Short mmCIF file of C-alpha atoms and ligand atoms in Angstrom, two decimals:
data_model
loop_
_atom_site.label_atom_id
_atom_site.label_comp_id
_atom_site.label_asym_id
_atom_site.label_seq_id
_atom_site.Cartn_x
_atom_site.Cartn_y
_atom_site.Cartn_z
CA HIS A 1 -21.63 22.72 -49.38
CA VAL A 2 -25.21 21.89 -49.24
CA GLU A 3 -26.15 23.73 -52.24
CA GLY A 4 -23.52 21.79 -54.30
CA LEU A 5 -24.88 18.54 -53.11
CA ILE A 6 -28.64 19.54 -53.73
CA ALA A 7 -27.35 20.24 -57.00
CA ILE A 8 -25.48 17.00 -57.63
CA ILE A 9 -28.26 14.63 -56.36
CA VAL A 10 -31.10 16.57 -58.49
CA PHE A 11 -28.90 16.64 -61.49
CA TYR A 12 -28.11 12.95 -61.34
CA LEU A 13 -31.87 12.01 -60.89
CA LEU A 14 -32.75 13.82 -63.75
CA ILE A 15 -30.05 12.32 -66.10
CA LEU A 16 -30.85 8.72 -64.83
CA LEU A 17 -34.71 9.38 -65.68
CA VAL A 18 -34.34 10.87 -68.98
CA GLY A 19 -31.88 7.97 -69.76
CA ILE A 20 -34.47 5.38 -68.67
CA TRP A 21 -37.22 7.27 -70.64
CA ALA A 22 -35.74 7.36 -73.94
CA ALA A 23 -35.07 3.52 -73.85
CA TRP A 24 -39.00 3.20 -73.84
CA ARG A 25 -39.60 5.81 -76.28
CA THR A 26 -37.19 4.59 -78.84
CA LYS A 27 -37.03 0.74 -78.22
CA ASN A 28 -39.25 -0.05 -81.50
CA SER A 29 -37.39 2.60 -83.59
CA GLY A 30 -35.24 0.43 -85.80
CA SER A 31 -34.97 -2.31 -88.52
CA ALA A 32 -37.33 -4.78 -86.84
CA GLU A 33 -35.15 -7.93 -87.96
CA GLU A 34 -31.76 -6.28 -86.96
CA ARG A 35 -31.42 -5.29 -83.61
CA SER A 36 -27.67 -5.23 -83.44
CA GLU A 37 -27.36 -2.35 -85.66
CA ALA A 38 -30.41 -0.47 -83.76
CA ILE A 39 -27.96 0.00 -80.64
CA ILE A 40 -24.95 0.96 -82.74
CA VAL A 41 -26.07 3.07 -85.65
CA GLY A 42 -29.28 4.01 -84.25
CA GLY A 43 -31.49 3.52 -87.43
CA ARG A 44 -29.55 6.18 -89.18
CA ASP A 45 -32.11 8.97 -88.67
CA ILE A 46 -30.85 11.83 -86.19
CA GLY A 47 -31.77 15.39 -87.35
CA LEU A 48 -29.80 18.80 -86.84
CA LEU A 49 -30.91 19.52 -83.06
CA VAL A 50 -30.30 16.26 -81.56
CA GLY A 51 -27.07 15.61 -83.44
CA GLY A 52 -25.91 19.32 -82.93
CA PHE A 53 -26.23 19.03 -79.17
CA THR A 54 -24.69 15.66 -78.78
CA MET A 55 -21.77 16.35 -81.07
CA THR A 56 -20.99 19.52 -79.09
CA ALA A 57 -21.46 17.62 -75.88
CA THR A 58 -19.02 14.91 -76.91
CA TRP A 59 -16.32 17.40 -77.40
CA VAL A 60 -16.73 19.94 -74.65
CA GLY A 61 -16.50 17.43 -71.61
CA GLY A 62 -13.55 16.16 -69.84
CA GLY A 63 -10.88 18.51 -69.08
CA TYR A 64 -11.93 21.39 -71.27
CA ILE A 65 -13.66 23.84 -69.11
CA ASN A 66 -11.34 23.31 -66.02
CA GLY A 67 -8.07 23.38 -67.81
CA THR A 68 -8.77 26.18 -70.17
CA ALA A 69 -9.02 28.57 -67.20
CA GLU A 70 -5.97 27.16 -65.54
CA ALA A 71 -3.70 27.84 -68.68
CA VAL A 72 -4.94 31.42 -68.55
CA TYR A 73 -4.42 31.96 -64.89
CA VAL A 74 -0.87 30.35 -64.31
CA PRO A 75 1.83 32.86 -64.89
CA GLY A 76 4.27 31.56 -67.78
CA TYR A 77 1.19 30.51 -69.62
CA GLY A 78 -1.88 32.34 -71.04
CA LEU A 79 -4.20 32.50 -73.93
CA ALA A 80 -1.19 31.66 -76.33
CA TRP A 81 -0.41 28.41 -74.39
CA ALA A 82 -4.25 27.69 -74.04
CA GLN A 83 -4.50 25.48 -77.28
CA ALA A 84 -7.68 23.26 -76.89
CA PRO A 85 -10.49 25.68 -77.93
CA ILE A 86 -8.44 26.24 -81.25
CA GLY A 87 -7.14 22.74 -81.79
CA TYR A 88 -10.63 21.37 -81.36
CA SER A 89 -12.28 23.70 -83.68
CA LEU A 90 -10.00 23.15 -86.35
CA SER A 91 -9.93 19.45 -86.05
CA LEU A 92 -13.81 19.37 -86.28
CA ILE A 93 -13.91 21.93 -89.44
CA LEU A 94 -11.21 19.64 -90.90
CA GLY A 95 -13.15 16.61 -90.34
CA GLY A 96 -16.52 17.81 -91.78
CA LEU A 97 -14.49 19.45 -94.45
CA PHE A 98 -12.57 16.29 -95.81
CA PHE A 99 -13.63 12.84 -93.94
CA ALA A 100 -17.32 12.92 -93.03
CA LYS A 101 -18.74 12.71 -96.32
CA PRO A 102 -16.99 9.77 -97.62
CA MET A 103 -17.60 7.68 -94.72
CA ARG A 104 -21.16 8.29 -94.52
CA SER A 105 -21.71 7.96 -98.02
CA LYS A 106 -20.64 4.46 -98.07
CA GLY A 107 -22.80 3.51 -95.30
CA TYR A 108 -20.33 2.09 -92.62
CA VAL A 109 -21.34 0.78 -89.33
CA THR A 110 -17.93 1.14 -87.28
CA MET A 111 -14.53 3.14 -87.88
CA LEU A 112 -12.81 -0.42 -88.25
CA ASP A 113 -15.23 -1.56 -91.26
CA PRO A 114 -13.03 0.27 -93.90
CA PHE A 115 -9.99 -1.49 -92.69
CA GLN A 116 -11.47 -4.92 -92.86
CA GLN A 117 -12.58 -4.90 -95.97
CA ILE A 118 -9.52 -3.84 -97.91
CA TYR A 119 -6.44 -4.68 -95.62
CA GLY A 120 -8.08 -8.05 -94.05
CA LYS A 121 -9.68 -8.93 -90.80
CA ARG A 122 -6.36 -9.53 -88.92
CA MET A 123 -5.06 -6.22 -89.89
CA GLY A 124 -8.57 -4.80 -88.66
CA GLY A 125 -7.89 -6.70 -85.59
CA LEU A 126 -4.46 -5.45 -85.00
CA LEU A 127 -5.64 -1.93 -85.31
CA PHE A 128 -8.16 -2.48 -82.46
CA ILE A 129 -5.73 -2.62 -79.94
CA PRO A 130 -4.82 1.21 -80.43
CA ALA A 131 -8.25 2.41 -80.31
CA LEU A 132 -9.62 0.25 -77.38
CA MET A 133 -6.81 1.54 -75.01
CA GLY A 134 -7.51 4.95 -75.84
CA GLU A 135 -11.31 4.87 -75.25
CA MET A 136 -10.77 2.92 -71.90
CA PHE A 137 -8.18 5.32 -70.41
CA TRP A 138 -9.96 8.47 -71.53
CA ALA A 139 -12.87 7.28 -69.31
CA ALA A 140 -10.61 6.63 -66.52
CA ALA A 141 -8.82 10.02 -66.80
CA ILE A 142 -12.48 11.58 -66.77
CA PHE A 143 -13.44 9.68 -63.69
CA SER A 144 -10.50 10.22 -61.70
CA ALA A 145 -10.79 14.28 -62.56
CA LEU A 146 -14.67 13.99 -61.53
CA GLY A 147 -13.64 12.63 -58.09
CA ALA A 148 -11.18 15.09 -57.46
CA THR A 149 -13.26 17.96 -58.60
CA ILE A 150 -16.25 16.52 -56.38
CA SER A 151 -13.95 16.10 -53.28
CA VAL A 152 -12.91 19.85 -53.98
CA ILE A 153 -16.51 21.10 -54.10
CA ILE A 154 -18.11 18.93 -51.16
CA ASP A 155 -16.54 16.37 -48.77
CA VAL A 156 -17.43 12.72 -49.96
CA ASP A 157 -14.54 10.34 -50.49
CA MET A 158 -13.48 9.58 -54.12
CA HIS A 159 -14.76 6.05 -53.79
CA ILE A 160 -18.64 6.36 -53.25
CA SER A 161 -18.45 9.47 -55.90
CA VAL A 162 -16.91 7.51 -58.59
CA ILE A 163 -18.84 4.57 -57.83
CA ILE A 164 -22.22 6.33 -57.79
CA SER A 165 -21.50 8.16 -61.12
CA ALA A 166 -19.99 5.06 -62.87
CA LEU A 167 -22.94 2.99 -62.01
CA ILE A 168 -25.40 5.71 -63.37
CA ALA A 169 -23.48 6.08 -66.44
CA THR A 170 -23.52 2.60 -67.29
CA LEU A 171 -26.86 1.45 -66.05
CA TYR A 172 -28.81 3.78 -68.87
CA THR A 173 -26.04 3.11 -71.42
CA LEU A 174 -26.46 -0.58 -71.63
CA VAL A 175 -30.36 -0.14 -71.45
CA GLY A 176 -30.57 2.32 -74.47
CA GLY A 177 -27.71 2.29 -76.63
CA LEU A 178 -27.15 5.40 -78.56
CA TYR A 179 -30.27 7.07 -78.36
CA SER A 180 -29.89 7.31 -74.54
CA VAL A 181 -26.57 8.78 -74.76
CA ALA A 182 -27.94 11.45 -77.37
CA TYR A 183 -31.09 12.26 -75.46
CA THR A 184 -29.18 12.54 -71.91
CA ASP A 185 -26.51 15.13 -73.60
CA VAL A 186 -29.18 17.85 -74.20
CA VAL A 187 -29.77 18.33 -70.55
CA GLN A 188 -25.95 18.57 -69.66
CA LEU A 189 -25.26 21.43 -72.58
CA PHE A 190 -28.59 23.01 -71.17
CA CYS A 191 -27.12 22.86 -67.47
CA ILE A 192 -23.66 24.03 -68.80
CA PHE A 193 -24.37 26.62 -70.84
CA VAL A 194 -27.08 28.35 -68.34
CA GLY A 195 -24.66 27.91 -65.11
CA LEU A 196 -21.76 29.25 -66.81
CA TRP A 197 -23.55 32.26 -68.39
CA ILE A 198 -25.50 33.30 -65.66
CA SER A 199 -22.40 32.91 -63.41
CA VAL A 200 -19.85 35.40 -65.26
CA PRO A 201 -21.55 38.62 -64.84
CA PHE A 202 -21.90 38.14 -61.11
CA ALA A 203 -18.24 37.58 -60.43
CA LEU A 204 -16.97 40.39 -62.71
CA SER A 205 -18.44 43.01 -60.16
CA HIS A 206 -16.94 41.87 -57.00
CA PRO A 207 -15.07 44.85 -55.44
CA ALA A 208 -11.83 42.63 -55.08
CA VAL A 209 -11.90 41.87 -59.00
CA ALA A 210 -10.19 44.49 -61.00
CA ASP A 211 -10.44 45.67 -64.96
CA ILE A 212 -9.85 42.52 -66.83
CA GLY A 213 -8.87 45.03 -69.97
CA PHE A 214 -5.72 46.74 -67.71
CA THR A 215 -4.83 43.38 -66.35
CA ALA A 216 -4.36 41.94 -69.68
CA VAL A 217 -1.82 44.15 -70.99
CA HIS A 218 -0.41 45.55 -67.81
CA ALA A 219 0.70 43.63 -64.76
CA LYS A 220 -0.94 44.77 -61.36
CA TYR A 221 -0.85 41.66 -59.08
CA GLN A 222 1.04 39.40 -61.41
CA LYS A 223 1.86 38.73 -65.03
CA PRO A 224 -0.14 39.86 -68.01
CA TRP A 225 -2.71 36.72 -68.97
CA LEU A 226 -2.32 36.95 -72.63
CA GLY A 227 0.83 35.04 -72.76
CA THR A 228 4.08 34.97 -75.10
CA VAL A 229 5.77 32.32 -77.13
CA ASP A 230 9.45 32.60 -77.17
CA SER A 231 11.73 31.81 -80.16
CA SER A 232 12.73 28.72 -78.59
CA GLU A 233 9.22 27.36 -77.72
CA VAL A 234 7.86 27.74 -81.37
CA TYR A 235 8.33 24.13 -82.29
CA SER A 236 6.91 22.55 -79.21
CA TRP A 237 3.96 24.83 -79.45
CA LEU A 238 3.30 23.68 -83.01
CA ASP A 239 3.77 19.77 -82.19
CA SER A 240 1.29 20.48 -79.16
CA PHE A 241 -1.25 22.10 -81.41
CA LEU A 242 -0.90 19.61 -84.02
CA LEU A 243 -1.42 16.75 -81.67
CA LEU A 244 -5.29 17.95 -80.85
CA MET A 245 -5.74 19.30 -84.48
CA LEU A 246 -4.93 16.10 -86.31
CA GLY A 247 -5.52 13.47 -83.42
CA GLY A 248 -8.96 14.40 -82.46
CA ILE A 249 -10.35 13.10 -85.99
CA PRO A 250 -9.29 9.35 -85.97
CA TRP A 251 -11.93 8.41 -82.70
CA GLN A 252 -14.61 6.22 -83.10
CA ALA A 253 -16.78 8.58 -80.78
CA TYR A 254 -16.61 11.22 -83.59
CA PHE A 255 -17.33 8.52 -86.27
CA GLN A 256 -20.51 7.34 -84.27
CA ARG A 257 -22.33 10.43 -84.84
CA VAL A 258 -21.08 11.08 -88.44
CA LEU A 259 -22.33 7.54 -89.48
CA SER A 260 -25.54 7.96 -87.74
CA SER A 261 -27.07 11.08 -89.87
CA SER A 262 -29.81 11.23 -92.53
CA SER A 263 -27.51 11.90 -95.29
CA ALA A 264 -24.02 13.05 -96.32
CA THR A 265 -25.13 16.72 -96.19
CA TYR A 266 -26.60 16.46 -92.84
CA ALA A 267 -22.95 14.70 -91.49
CA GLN A 268 -21.16 17.85 -92.43
CA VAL A 269 -23.42 20.49 -90.87
CA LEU A 270 -23.36 18.75 -87.34
CA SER A 271 -19.46 19.11 -87.54
CA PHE A 272 -19.85 22.73 -88.69
CA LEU A 273 -22.11 23.63 -85.72
CA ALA A 274 -20.03 21.71 -83.18
CA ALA A 275 -17.07 23.81 -84.27
CA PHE A 276 -18.92 26.92 -83.29
CA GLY A 277 -20.26 25.23 -80.09
CA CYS A 278 -16.77 24.82 -78.69
CA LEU A 279 -15.66 28.20 -79.31
CA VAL A 280 -19.21 29.50 -77.87
CA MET A 281 -18.62 27.45 -74.49
CA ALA A 282 -14.94 28.43 -74.04
CA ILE A 283 -15.47 32.10 -73.42
CA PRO A 284 -16.80 31.93 -69.75
CA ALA A 285 -13.72 29.94 -68.94
CA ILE A 286 -11.38 32.25 -70.43
CA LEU A 287 -13.59 35.28 -68.46
CA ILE A 288 -13.22 33.28 -65.19
CA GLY A 289 -9.38 32.64 -65.63
CA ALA A 290 -8.86 36.23 -66.25
CA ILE A 291 -10.89 37.15 -63.18
CA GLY A 292 -9.01 34.81 -61.43
CA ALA A 293 -5.83 36.45 -62.33
CA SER A 294 -6.83 39.96 -61.54
CA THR A 295 -8.35 39.32 -58.14
CA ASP A 296 -6.65 40.27 -55.17
CA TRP A 297 -7.23 37.40 -52.69
CA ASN A 298 -6.62 39.19 -49.47
CA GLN A 299 -10.50 40.90 -49.31
CA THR A 300 -12.00 37.31 -50.05
CA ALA A 301 -12.63 34.33 -47.55
CA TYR A 302 -9.90 32.50 -49.29
CA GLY A 303 -6.96 34.15 -47.41
CA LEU A 304 -3.70 35.63 -48.18
CA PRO A 305 -2.09 32.42 -49.77
CA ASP A 306 -3.03 32.71 -53.40
CA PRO A 307 -4.30 29.92 -54.89
CA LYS A 308 -1.33 29.10 -57.08
CA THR A 309 0.93 29.51 -54.18
CA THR A 310 -0.97 27.01 -52.04
CA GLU A 311 -0.84 24.65 -55.04
CA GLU A 312 -4.30 24.57 -56.10
CA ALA A 313 -4.28 25.89 -59.56
CA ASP A 314 -6.40 23.11 -61.35
CA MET A 315 -9.43 24.16 -59.29
CA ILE A 316 -9.40 28.03 -60.01
CA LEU A 317 -12.81 28.03 -61.79
CA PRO A 318 -14.51 26.15 -58.74
CA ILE A 319 -12.86 28.36 -56.59
CA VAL A 320 -13.95 31.70 -58.22
CA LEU A 321 -17.59 30.26 -58.67
CA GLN A 322 -17.75 29.83 -55.02
CA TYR A 323 -15.93 32.82 -53.22
CA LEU A 324 -16.80 35.41 -55.72
CA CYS A 325 -20.69 34.45 -56.39
CA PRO A 326 -23.70 34.74 -54.39
CA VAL A 327 -25.13 31.53 -53.09
CA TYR A 328 -28.14 31.41 -55.49
CA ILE A 329 -25.96 31.46 -58.43
CA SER A 330 -22.96 29.55 -56.94
CA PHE A 331 -25.57 26.45 -56.91
CA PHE A 332 -25.96 26.69 -60.93
CA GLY A 333 -22.24 27.22 -61.31
CA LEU A 334 -21.22 24.16 -59.14
CA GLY A 335 -23.99 22.21 -61.22
CA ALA A 336 -22.56 23.33 -64.43
CA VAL A 337 -19.13 22.08 -63.61
CA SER A 338 -20.25 18.88 -62.51
CA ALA A 339 -22.04 18.46 -65.49
CA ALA A 340 -19.09 19.50 -67.92
CA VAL A 341 -16.52 16.96 -66.11
CA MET A 342 -18.76 13.91 -66.80
CA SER A 343 -19.69 14.62 -70.53
CA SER A 344 -17.74 12.04 -72.38
CA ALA A 345 -17.82 9.01 -70.52
CA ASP A 346 -20.76 7.05 -71.79
CA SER A 347 -19.73 7.74 -75.31
CA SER A 348 -16.10 6.18 -74.63
CA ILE A 349 -17.82 3.17 -73.31
CA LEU A 350 -20.22 2.76 -76.10
CA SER A 351 -17.60 3.31 -78.41
CA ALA A 352 -15.30 0.83 -76.80
CA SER A 353 -18.31 -1.89 -76.60
CA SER A 354 -19.62 -1.26 -80.09
CA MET A 355 -16.17 -2.44 -81.87
CA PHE A 356 -15.80 -5.64 -79.66
CA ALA A 357 -19.53 -6.41 -80.34
CA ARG A 358 -19.36 -6.18 -83.85
CA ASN A 359 -15.76 -6.54 -85.45
CA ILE A 360 -14.30 -8.69 -83.03
CA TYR A 361 -16.94 -11.19 -81.77
CA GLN A 362 -19.42 -11.27 -84.92
CA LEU A 363 -17.29 -10.65 -88.04
CA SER A 364 -14.26 -12.66 -86.98
CA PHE A 365 -14.95 -15.30 -84.18
CA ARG A 366 -18.59 -16.15 -84.42
CA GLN A 367 -19.98 -15.45 -87.86
CA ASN A 368 -23.26 -17.36 -87.42
CA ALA A 369 -24.74 -15.60 -84.36
CA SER A 370 -28.43 -14.44 -84.14
CA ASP A 371 -29.00 -10.88 -83.23
CA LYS A 372 -30.32 -12.02 -79.73
CA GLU A 373 -26.92 -13.37 -79.04
CA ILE A 374 -25.27 -10.48 -80.35
CA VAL A 375 -27.46 -8.14 -78.33
CA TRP A 376 -26.56 -10.12 -74.91
CA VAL A 377 -22.91 -9.88 -75.88
CA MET A 378 -23.09 -5.87 -76.47
CA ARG A 379 -24.68 -5.60 -73.09
CA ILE A 380 -22.11 -7.85 -70.97
CA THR A 381 -19.49 -5.95 -73.01
CA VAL A 382 -20.89 -2.37 -71.86
CA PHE A 383 -20.96 -3.67 -68.12
CA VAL A 384 -17.25 -5.11 -68.18
CA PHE A 385 -15.89 -2.26 -69.86
CA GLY A 386 -17.69 0.13 -67.27
CA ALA A 387 -16.54 -1.98 -64.34
CA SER A 388 -12.70 -2.00 -65.72
CA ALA A 389 -12.70 1.61 -66.25
CA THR A 390 -13.81 2.22 -62.86
CA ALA A 391 -11.49 -0.21 -61.34
CA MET A 392 -8.64 1.36 -62.96
CA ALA A 393 -9.49 4.83 -61.82
CA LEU A 394 -9.91 3.82 -58.36
CA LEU A 395 -7.14 1.55 -57.73
CA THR A 396 -4.12 2.21 -60.10
CA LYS A 397 -1.89 5.39 -59.79
CA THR A 398 -0.96 5.46 -63.43
CA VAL A 399 -3.93 6.54 -65.06
CA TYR A 400 -2.40 9.91 -66.74
CA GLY A 401 0.80 8.03 -67.49
CA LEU A 402 -0.86 5.43 -69.67
CA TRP A 403 -3.43 8.04 -70.93
CA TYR A 404 -0.47 10.12 -72.50
CA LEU A 405 0.97 6.91 -74.15
CA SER A 406 -2.13 6.03 -75.84
CA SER A 407 -2.80 9.38 -77.09
CA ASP A 408 0.34 9.46 -78.71
CA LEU A 409 -0.15 5.92 -80.07
CA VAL A 410 -3.30 6.71 -81.35
CA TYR A 411 -2.26 10.00 -83.27
CA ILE A 412 0.95 8.15 -84.71
CA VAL A 413 -0.56 4.86 -85.97
CA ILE A 414 -4.42 5.22 -86.55
CA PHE A 415 -4.51 8.56 -88.33
CA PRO A 416 -2.07 7.76 -91.19
CA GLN A 417 -3.78 4.49 -91.86
CA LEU A 418 -7.01 6.60 -92.26
CA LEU A 419 -5.73 8.85 -94.85
CA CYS A 420 -4.11 6.04 -96.60
CA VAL A 421 -7.35 4.04 -96.97
CA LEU A 422 -9.59 7.09 -97.68
CA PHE A 423 -7.51 9.10 -100.27
CA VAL A 424 -4.60 7.18 -101.56
CA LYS A 425 -5.00 4.28 -104.11
CA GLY A 426 -2.76 1.36 -104.54
CA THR A 427 -2.05 0.75 -101.04
CA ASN A 428 -1.78 -2.80 -99.72
CA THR A 429 -1.60 -5.01 -96.53
CA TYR A 430 2.24 -4.99 -97.00
CA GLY A 431 2.52 -1.36 -95.98
CA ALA A 432 0.10 -1.30 -93.28
CA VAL A 433 2.25 -3.56 -91.28
CA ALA A 434 5.22 -1.50 -92.17
CA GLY A 435 3.42 1.54 -91.02
CA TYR A 436 2.18 -0.20 -87.61
CA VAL A 437 5.63 -1.59 -86.86
CA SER A 438 7.53 1.90 -87.73
CA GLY A 439 5.21 4.14 -85.75
CA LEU A 440 5.24 1.44 -82.60
CA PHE A 441 8.87 1.14 -82.76
CA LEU A 442 9.67 5.11 -82.75
CA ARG A 443 7.12 5.79 -80.26
CA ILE A 444 8.42 3.08 -77.62
CA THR A 445 11.93 3.30 -78.24
CA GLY A 446 12.73 7.18 -79.39
CA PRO A 447 9.25 17.47 -82.13
CA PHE A 448 9.87 13.66 -82.40
CA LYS A 449 5.95 13.00 -82.13
CA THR A 450 5.08 14.58 -85.49
CA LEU A 451 8.10 13.09 -87.10
CA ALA A 452 7.09 9.52 -86.32
CA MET A 453 3.55 10.13 -87.86
CA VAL A 454 5.26 11.52 -91.14
CA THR A 455 7.87 8.56 -90.94
CA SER A 456 4.82 5.89 -90.40
CA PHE A 457 2.93 7.49 -93.24
CA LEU A 458 5.71 7.66 -95.45
CA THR A 459 6.77 3.95 -94.90
CA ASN A 460 3.20 2.76 -95.69
CA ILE A 461 3.48 4.21 -99.18
CA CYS A 462 6.82 3.10 -100.39
CA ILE A 463 6.54 -0.64 -99.06
CA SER A 464 3.17 -0.97 -100.44
CA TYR A 465 4.33 0.29 -104.05
CA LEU A 466 7.50 -1.76 -103.62
CA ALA A 467 5.49 -4.79 -102.68
CA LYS A 468 3.76 -4.54 -106.07
CA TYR A 469 6.91 -4.66 -107.62
CA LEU A 470 8.15 -7.42 -105.51
C1 LIG B 1 -4.42 42.43 -46.61
O1 LIG B 1 -5.31 42.79 -45.75
C2 LIG B 1 -5.00 43.12 -44.51
C3 LIG B 1 -6.19 43.19 -43.56
O2 LIG B 1 -6.40 41.91 -43.22
C4 LIG B 1 -4.38 44.44 -44.63
O3 LIG B 1 -2.84 44.68 -44.16
C5 LIG B 1 -2.78 46.12 -43.65
O4 LIG B 1 -1.36 46.41 -43.99
C6 LIG B 1 -0.96 47.55 -43.20
C7 LIG B 1 0.39 47.99 -43.88
O5 LIG B 1 0.07 49.14 -44.55
C8 LIG B 1 -0.85 47.18 -41.55
O6 LIG B 1 -1.16 48.41 -41.07
C9 LIG B 1 -0.09 48.52 -40.00
O7 LIG B 1 -0.44 47.67 -38.74
C10 LIG B 1 0.69 47.85 -37.98
C11 LIG B 1 0.30 46.72 -36.68
O8 LIG B 1 0.71 45.56 -37.54
C12 LIG B 1 0.52 49.11 -37.04
O9 LIG B 1 1.42 49.46 -36.20
C13 LIG B 1 0.64 50.15 -38.31
O10 LIG B 1 0.58 51.28 -37.58
C14 LIG B 1 -0.27 50.05 -39.56
O11 LIG B 1 -1.52 50.26 -39.12
C15 LIG B 1 -1.84 46.02 -41.32
O12 LIG B 1 -1.04 44.79 -41.59
C16 LIG B 1 -2.93 45.85 -42.20
N1 LIG B 1 -3.68 47.28 -41.92
C17 LIG B 1 -5.45 47.15 -41.59
C18 LIG B 1 -5.83 48.50 -41.65
O13 LIG B 1 -5.67 46.08 -41.87
C19 LIG B 1 -4.38 45.00 -46.33
O14 LIG B 1 -5.33 45.49 -46.47
C20 LIG B 1 -3.37 43.79 -46.85
N2 LIG B 1 -2.12 43.69 -46.73
C21 LIG B 1 -1.22 42.99 -47.71
C22 LIG B 1 0.20 43.09 -47.25
O15 LIG B 1 -1.63 42.63 -48.70
C1 LIG B 2 -4.76 13.13 -79.35
O1 LIG B 2 -6.18 13.16 -79.01
C2 LIG B 2 -6.24 14.21 -77.99
C3 LIG B 2 -5.25 14.89 -77.18
C4 LIG B 2 -5.67 15.43 -75.92
C5 LIG B 2 -6.90 15.75 -75.56
C6 LIG B 2 -7.43 16.79 -74.70
O2 LIG B 2 -8.62 16.66 -74.00
N1 LIG B 2 -6.30 17.20 -73.74
C7 LIG B 2 -6.96 17.91 -72.30
C8 LIG B 2 -7.26 17.41 -71.60
C9 LIG B 2 -6.81 16.32 -70.50
C10 LIG B 2 -7.79 15.95 -69.66
C11 LIG B 2 -7.94 14.85 -68.65
C12 LIG B 2 -9.25 14.30 -68.78
C13 LIG B 2 -6.83 13.88 -68.88
N2 LIG B 2 -8.93 16.83 -70.21
O3 LIG B 2 -8.49 17.60 -71.10
C14 LIG B 2 -7.96 15.10 -76.20
C15 LIG B 2 -7.88 14.51 -77.44
O4 LIG B 2 -8.56 13.80 -78.14
C16 LIG B 2 -10.09 13.82 -77.57
C17 LIG B 2 -10.75 14.50 -78.65
C18 LIG B 2 -12.22 14.61 -78.43
N3 LIG B 2 -12.86 13.49 -78.24
C19 LIG B 2 -12.82 12.49 -79.54
C20 LIG B 2 -12.17 12.37 -77.08
C21 LIG B 2 -10.72 12.29 -77.64
NA1 NA B 3 -22.03 12.41 -74.47
#
């Protein structure tokens, strides 16, 4: 109620102030005669602390902490079917092991730079379409989820909340660039960590909560929360896991921090330190889900209808932090959830705008452009993309339907091409078109998600080698 609103106002004011202050601090830190790169790659000196904070904050936002508890709470699901915490960590480990050093060693600026140099500028432009939709729909889904969460916590209609959040996210982003985004994520990580880890001890001691050890393997009010994977569901489980594991890498939000580190060796340690952070920040969510599963919602104020019978199972974590915690701590908990839902919007906006500013506007349409023109183009693009994302979140009712399609398209199309450029020699632009056509055809017409990725990958190689033989 009042405590939640007081937390939100303070948190957003602090974030705005830090974002503005970072721009003043770091306006002069860059190549003095190349201002276009200073707002994209950041001057190529970010250490272990700031890098480790921002890389962790990128991957631990969105629906992570609010859908990790829901999977544990809902009967028929459990720890077996909560695959985000393990998918993200394995994706980060694989990235740091195999992809991070080669990309940073060659000193690229954007993810599309490898493609345009070998395949061609036209093919680099064609691969811009799948990425831009993903970056512009992840932000829309995040904005919708934030509105839902805030309308549950307090009563302010979705429009004002989403508009006020999006304006603040865009304002410091266009003013600062990468440095504001990186310096504003330390506050978010500290808020989330402190709130969740101070809330969890108080919830566990409520008289209504039972023993989470006994509930895990024995049924008291509902089915055990460890879960079970049936013999029929093995392949669906593997496909769902592989989507997150092998589809989180080919994103520019990830490659904007791999390419902005001091050296190749410091671009691996950040991934290895973010893999640990993803696991560290997921334990309180699992614990809150287990609490919610073990609780008896008849002595608390929520009333006899259980949250999953009233059809509020997406908001189990706010309900626990509100009803099973004292107000002093509920303040910190609600601030933490509000910080958690908002984490990965600015990174997506900056990632979407940087590629259009560099690869599309500069390198293809207008090569002969000064740095001032490109700076203004980047700022205008940031504003337009933020406005478009907010409008899509508020008006259209098909945000998730398009997010699901774009997520599949990225994993089926972009990932096979990245492997081919980085690790396979002899590839041509005659096989890139074949892969791009074959993946799209199978996705649109008709586990078939992973089989399309292998068909897209294996059609890239055979045609490219065949074209050499003609
Ligand atoms: C949920 O909480 C309620 C309290 O809000 C409790 O319900 C208890 O259930 C007992 C049944 O063992 C009931 O007691 C009976 O009440 C009738 C009148 O309706 C009376 O004629 C009987 O002699 C007997 O006392 C009553 O509904 C209620 N009892 C008390 C003392 O509150 C209980 O804690 C929980 N119930 C469930 C179904 O989860
Ligand atoms: C194929 O790539 C992904 C597939 C699924 C997810 C995922 O988060 N799913 C659960 C979910 C939904 C929601 C709502 C907001 C809609 N919040 O969480 C994320 C994926 O890539 C991200 C990986 C981290 N970073 C690079 C951004 C992209
Ligand atoms: Na961020």
